[model samples]
Target: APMKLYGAVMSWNLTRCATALEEAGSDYEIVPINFATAEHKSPEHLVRNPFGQVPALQDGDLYLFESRAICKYAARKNKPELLREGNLEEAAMVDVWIEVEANQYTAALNPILFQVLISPMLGGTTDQKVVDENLEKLKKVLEVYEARLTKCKYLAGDFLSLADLNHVSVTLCLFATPYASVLDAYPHVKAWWSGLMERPSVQKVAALMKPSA
Candidate 1:
């Protein structure tokens, strides 16, 4: 049976999983939960994801949550060849980028984007101080990315791997949100993002999301 993906069409977490499934050429079902009405927090939905989060994946009787975890699981189980070569060092490098993406890059970007976009749209005001703080933090993170990209085509090196995909999936959230200008300061990051955008999977999922309110 095909994998079943439980998520809203516009959720960043859901989009991340969908992108991985698309890139891996997997057959899947999109079981969308209505976010505007708080359907995700409902008991029926919580049964699929005990935490009541979107982007839960069900493969037969097996289940998984968390977007990055889902992405890594999909890559490792479906495309092990993409994880690394025969060398331990290369594998370690791939792992390093994945860690950086989750701990450093996504950590800084998601909050600022959410504050400047989602919170305000949901009737909350954007805190200028928070935006200022996050922008500075994001700049430092992007500098590391800039230096690395100057030497390699992708985050893990010449080939596109989990490292690049993980970051790309997370960062794609910005496009729908209002803080897209957060990337303007880093030219290399911008170039890398543009390159990723040209990919079939990125392009496909991107078109499905509405711009942030």
Candidate 2:
């Protein structure tokens, strides 16, 4: 494998890169880090990603964190059609949807993930109020997605782009858990998410990455 990614197989951030790499048909390796032992913060891992993130891509000598950035890198490496650049309008639209994921969707969904997954792992209790607040926020975000997807096949116009791919992991977590019902209220958003889940790349990653499945 020419591409080596340092992270746990079940890490949602790493799962983002893995979905793109698999979609691109690229050879890659996953380097497991035992968070139980705090190996992700070890000096060796710190050199690769200063923030102590699970996923740090090492493609030859290059290193990249930020799951979406890593996916873009893989898209370029294989020339996958998921990310379209160079066209001024198309690129801008791609960036817009990408930002939607970064600034809005991920921001809202992450709190739920922290509660349902990370907190339980750390001997902490889940807060229903926090989960409700985030789900309300997520519902509002998806309402916009519902409107957009009703018009187009994907987030960025009609074509499949990095925007859709970036969302696989977080939503997959939803599908694997009780939180999936949160999406049922939005028809178009639910359909769009279902479409993403049907992709071979997403299916493969979901089967492998979904917790306690």
Candidate 3:
């Protein structure tokens, strides 16, 4: 049986999982949950994800939550080629990039984007000071990525890997949010993002959901 994905289409977490699934060439089903209506917190979804989060994956009798974990599992299982394939060093490098993306980069970027875009959408104003501080922090992180990408084609190396995919998934959310112009300061990052945008898997599964400014 095909795998089933539970989440809302517009959700970044869900979109990330969708992109990974597409890249893996996996056949899956998307079950949309009305987040605004709190459907994700309903008993049925809770059975699949006790945390009541979107982007839960169900494969046959097995179920999994957490977007990054799900994406990693899908990539390793269905498209091992998209992950590091050689010796321990190469695998360690891939793992390092993935860890950086999850632990460092996204942690610094997502909160600012949420405050600037999502908060206002939910009827709240963002603190300009906080936005400025977060933007500066994110710029520093992007500078590191710029230096890395200038030397390598992708985050993990010449070929795209789970690392690149994870970064693209998170960065795309910022690109679609009010922080869309954040990439303007980093040419290499902009080019990398454009390259990812041109990929068939990303193009097919990730939608531009940014509200008009």
Candidate 4:
């Protein structure tokens, strides 16, 4: 049976999961949540996610939440190569870069995305101050990525891994924002992103992340 992902790809978190499942070569279905009707908060959905979040994953009898965890689970189960578990050093680096992505990259990018992409949709004005603050933080984050990417083809090492996969969703959102050109300043980072864009999994998830008319 295909794993059931309880959310739409329009969600960054859900998109993240989708990218992982794609890269892992797992069979799965994205079950859309009716946010309009608060269906995510219903009892059935709540059982999948206690926090009433969009990305509750049901794989066999196991249930999981937290997008990052879901990504790791998918990759671990279907594509352990994505984790580089055979090599201790590579696995540690993969874990390190994954933490950096979640803690530093996403931490800074989320606010900028909210200000640029999400706020206006809710009929709220963009908070330039918030966007500027997070952009600065993101620049710092990207600087480290720039330096790091100069050393290897991918974040964990020479091979693509979960660390690289994790950045696809938020980075895609960043490209849609006014600061889309942000990556241009970092040649290696920009090049790395271009490489990610070439992957079939990333391409598929990119298409899914687009809003419907």
TM-score of each model, paired residue for residue: 0.88, 0.92, 0.89, 0.96
Task: Please name the candidate that would achieve the greatest lDDT relative to the true structure.
Answer: 4
lDDT of 1 by residue, 17-67 (tens): 877777777777888778788888898777777888878888887778888
Of 1 and 4, the candidate ranking higher by lDDT: 4
Q: Residue 134, candidate 3: how far off, in angstroms?
A: 0.7
TM-score of 1: 0.88
Ranking of all candidate structures by their TM-score, best first: 4, 2, 3, 1
Clashes of each: 1, 0, 0, 0
Q: What is the C-alpha lDDT of each candidate?
A: 0.78, 0.83, 0.80, 0.88
RMSD value for candidate 4: 1.2
Q: Put down candidate 4 lDDT per residue, 114-133, tens digits, no spaces.
A: 87878889899899999999
* Poorest lDDT segment (10 consecutive residues) of candidate 3: 204-213
Stretches of candidate 1 above 4 Å error? 35-43, 211-213
- Off-target runs (Cα >4 Å) in candidate 4 are none
Winning candidate number (TM-score): 4
Prediction 3 global C-alpha lDDT: 0.80
List all candidate RMSDs to the true structure. 2.4, 1.7, 2.4, 1.2
Off by over 4 Å in 2: 211-213
- Residue 195 error for model 4, in Å? 0.6
lDDT of 3 by residue, 33-85 (tens): 88788998999888889988878999887779998888887787888877766
